[model samples]
Target: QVPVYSEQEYQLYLHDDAWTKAETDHLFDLSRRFDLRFVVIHDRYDHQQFKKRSVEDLKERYYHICAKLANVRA
Candidate 1:
């Protein structure tokens, strides 16, 4: 499970202070490998350091629709 990162505790958990591009790049590179589709589903990712506890998890889900499907019909 994605462990709870509370708003007040976010700073203590993460070290992305300089906003380095490495992690950003890695998440993206991995994301691109799937049968990618962009959809607006409701999930939440909150930053307690940003005062985002009780958060909506994530406002979007960058999805593949079906993981087994290697392509999109569109």
Candidate 2:
């Protein structure tokens, strides 16, 4: 499940170079837009100047961020 994160929480979760704010927000936007239907989000996401990210990679990064964000909220 994709947990909730405020903008500030998103910022807090960002990793330097691994993902930019724009990329992360795009994922979150897609997650919300599709209501966590990850297959659709994985199919739809497009990143520039980078190799296509595997669904596993996306999930790993996204969940890691969500975990950190949730910890911050707690």
Candidate 3:
């Protein structure tokens, strides 16, 4: 269970159509495995369909998703 946040939580964070669900899920998986290392996440990220995201964007999204997670559980 890499993504602790559910799909419902995914919506709260700012997301664009360019980021497919699968791609975002993959990003979350990396976030969990790499402990939110934006560099590592960026290095591992690969998706031709989804727009290439910058390390800063990835960090922002990851933290926002994590923040939503806390709000949901809290």
lDDT of each: 0.27, 0.74, 0.72
Worst 10 residues of 2 by lDDT: 7-16
Evaluate residue 59 in candidate 3 and report its C-alpha lDDT on the 0 to 100 scale.
Answer: 73
Where model 1 places Cα greater than 4 Å from the true spot, the runs are: 1-19, 36-74
Judged by TM-score relative to the true structure, which candidate is superior, 2 or 3?
2
If the candidates were sorted by their TM-score against the true structure, best first, what order would they fall in? 2, 3, 1
Clashing pairs in 1: 7-48, 43-57, 43-58, 44-56, 44-57, 44-58, 45-57, 45-58
Q: What are the per-model C-alpha RMSD values against the true structure? A: 13.9, 2.4, 3.0
TM-score of each: 0.24, 0.75, 0.69
lDDT of 3 by residue, 1-74 (tens): 34475677667654655666787788888887888778888988874655688998887776666666777678
Candidate 2, residues 15-74: lDDT per residue as tens digits?
Answer: 657777777777878888888877898888975644478888778877888777767768
Which runs of model 3 end up more than 4 angstroms from their true locations? 1-3, 7-18
Candidate 1 lDDT, tens digit per residue, 1-74? 11222333334333344432333233333345432221211112223223332212221211211221224222
Candidate 2 colliding pairs = none
